[PDB]
Amino acid sequence: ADVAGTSNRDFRGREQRLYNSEQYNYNNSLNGEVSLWVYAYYSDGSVLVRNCNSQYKVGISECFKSLKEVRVGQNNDPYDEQEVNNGVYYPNGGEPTKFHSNAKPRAIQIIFSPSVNVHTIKMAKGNSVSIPKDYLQRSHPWEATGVKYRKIHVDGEIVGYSHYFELPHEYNSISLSVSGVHKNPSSYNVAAPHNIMDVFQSCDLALKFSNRYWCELELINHYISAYAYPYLDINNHKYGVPLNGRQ
Amino acid sequence: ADVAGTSNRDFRGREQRLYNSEQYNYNNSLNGEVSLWVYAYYSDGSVLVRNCNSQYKVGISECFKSLKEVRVGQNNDPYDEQEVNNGVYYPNGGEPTKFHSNAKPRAIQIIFSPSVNVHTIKMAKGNSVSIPKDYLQRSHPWEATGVKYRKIHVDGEIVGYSHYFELPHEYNSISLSVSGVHKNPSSYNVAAPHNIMDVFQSCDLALKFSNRYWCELELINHYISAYAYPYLDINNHKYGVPLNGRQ
Amino acid sequence: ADVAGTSNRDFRGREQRLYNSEQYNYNNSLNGEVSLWVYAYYSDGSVLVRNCNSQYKVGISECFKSLKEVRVGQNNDPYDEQEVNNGVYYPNGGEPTKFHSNAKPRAIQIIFSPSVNVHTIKMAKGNSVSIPKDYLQRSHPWEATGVKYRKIHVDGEIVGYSHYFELPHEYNSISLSVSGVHKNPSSYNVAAPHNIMDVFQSCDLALKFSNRYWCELELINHYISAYAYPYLDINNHKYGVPLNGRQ
Numbered sequence A, B, C: 001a002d003v004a005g006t007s008n009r010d011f012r013g014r015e016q017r018l019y020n021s022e023q024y025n026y027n028n029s030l031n032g033e034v035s036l037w038v039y040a041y042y043s044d045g046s047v048l049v050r051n052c053n054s055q056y057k058v059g060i061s062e063c064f065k066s067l068k069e070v071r072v073g074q075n076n077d078p079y080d081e082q083e084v085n086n087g088v089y090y091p092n093g094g095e096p097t098k099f100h101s102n103a104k105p106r107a108i109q110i111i112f113s114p115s116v117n118v119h120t121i122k123m124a125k126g127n128s129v130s131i132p133k134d135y136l137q138r139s140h141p142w143e144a145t146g147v148k149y150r151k152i153h154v155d156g157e158i159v160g161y162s163h164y165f166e167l168p169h170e171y172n173s174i175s176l177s178v179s180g181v182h183k184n185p186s187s188y189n190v191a192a193p194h195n196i197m198d199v200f201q202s203c204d205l206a207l208k209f210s211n212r213y214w215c216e217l218e219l220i221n222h223y224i225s226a227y228a229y230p231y232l233d234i235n236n237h238k239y240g241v242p243l244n245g246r247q
Ligand SMILES: Nc1nc2c(ncn2[C@@H]2O[C@H](COP(=O)(O)OP(=O)(O)OP(=O)(O)O)[C@@H](O)[C@H]2O)c(=O)[nH]1
Pocket: A155, A246
């Protein structure tokens, strides 16, 4: 046989490139996943991830309470933190023993898989009682924020999209929902009657994951890298596996 | 300039009326929210609110367990109350230390924002094992109860709609789901293919809120009134902010 | 009057047969329920049931954590079991005091009501971090497994459909979502614009139930049999109430 890496008959090499190209492009097909991660960063260095993976479209909806840090199997002062909630839903509305709950997220990162169409991304960053803009009567139920999403580039390939905002001020008390639609460069509407009920089933079939990792390093090692997820750390370092046309 | 409140050139006055009219009418546009509140009233005077705010349509789905009172950070006798559940799912099916759990709701109030079309309201008030009418084989999955919803009037304006039923008997052990569709006087179907996928995204983007307030007074002060929500208290007093054509 | 059970004028008998036939056939109408049960079997003999009942379509979505056994009001070693989760999300990723968590399900049974169309059944049996097939880039978000569903026959009538798989190996660490569509032998698309928004409302109105029964016998007695649900026990015994054309 020919010698490896010297001719057009390195079929092992051509198969390896095809395998990676097929995965990248299958992800972008109508049969592929679109994936959303919401990372909540806490002052103790830990990071809650909410992940959802689904066909056609994907979303995550959180309230002020559900984004707060919960240390499973450790002391979370649940009564005091319920009083924090009362005091955050309405000024001077509770009696916690603290000015600022360290369970409040300090930052949110939203990451989409590269199979999303950024023009469809919608976000409702609301107040602590789950109103998009102060009062329901004046509230558009979402903002289209795709123009703020940064590309996560690795080796010249877009491995994901990131929107990141900090919550450093005492009044950064939020509720959060995010939604994005899978790429569809075709004119075949996936939610038109020929396929509409499969989009309803995709709502049933969406797989959700949640975990609080002890720090960004551990998140990077045992979640992002282990499962070929895109990521952007606090030092602006990009993570991901470039696939298209690549060995 | 002209003197305030004497002529047609009080632009400050005309702007104030426009601002309120715009909020009222924006809420009723296809871009606006439709909002649902389910209030569960407990014998100790406290009130659980489940709220959801979303575009196009909105809903809440609860089971018998999820409506029971949970005092966050206090003793809830979780083992005994699990035995209550077993004894409520099937007669003589458990061994709690009590005949009637005081965590069982005594009443439900359903309130919709004025942007709902009452003809679309649907409710599945089921039994304790989440069957609409005793057995699945005979169950229509909802009842259309819009004709029972009372208008919450303030200053002549409908600020919301209310359906209220008490659960005073020992056999009032329910599961509950409610759904309502936003007003659409146009013939443009918001869930037809031109816009269907935005309705799927509205399912992702719906913002949810839940809290147990210690009494109706506190609910009225720090939730209803603070955020311009409609309400109807036990004394048939109406709460809300009239907006259309108003300063 | 005629004597009972001797002539065509036993209207009591004809009414009884009609009543049962009407229930069976109403369940199969577009107005009827389609119901899904996911049973998680634990090594201590207890069984978690997740049930959802809804019109048009129905689904359940679980992750690795949410399928684990939780003994309400008893000791569940929450910190140790969080370390199990970390160690199951990534090999050698945690420090629990145990090799195998007895909270891990040993088997899953999926049961649909007889009103499902098995050709629409979809399942995403994913890994412990909620990926269908190891990596998102290669993942079809579901498998169509209807050909594996066994009919639950009683007295010659299909009272339900069952898919059962064991999780006996240490690497059987799963996430699970299931979806099925109600029968529609007509060509009237229930999710076409004439009725699409009612399918969105059915997403709001779906009633959910969850309980952990102490053993299969108790499940059979106080859940399956009490509410005329189909079931298949470990000894291949079928449970259900045949209805069509029957007294
Ligand atoms: N493209 C390129 N890569 C370089 C160069 N010098 C060092 N490298 C490294 O080599 C890597 C790319 O090697 P290859 O993937 O085999 O080259 P390629 O440009 O992708 O060409 P093909 O894959 O054969 O189509 C890059 O990631 C660089 O880190 C250079 O001059 N050009």
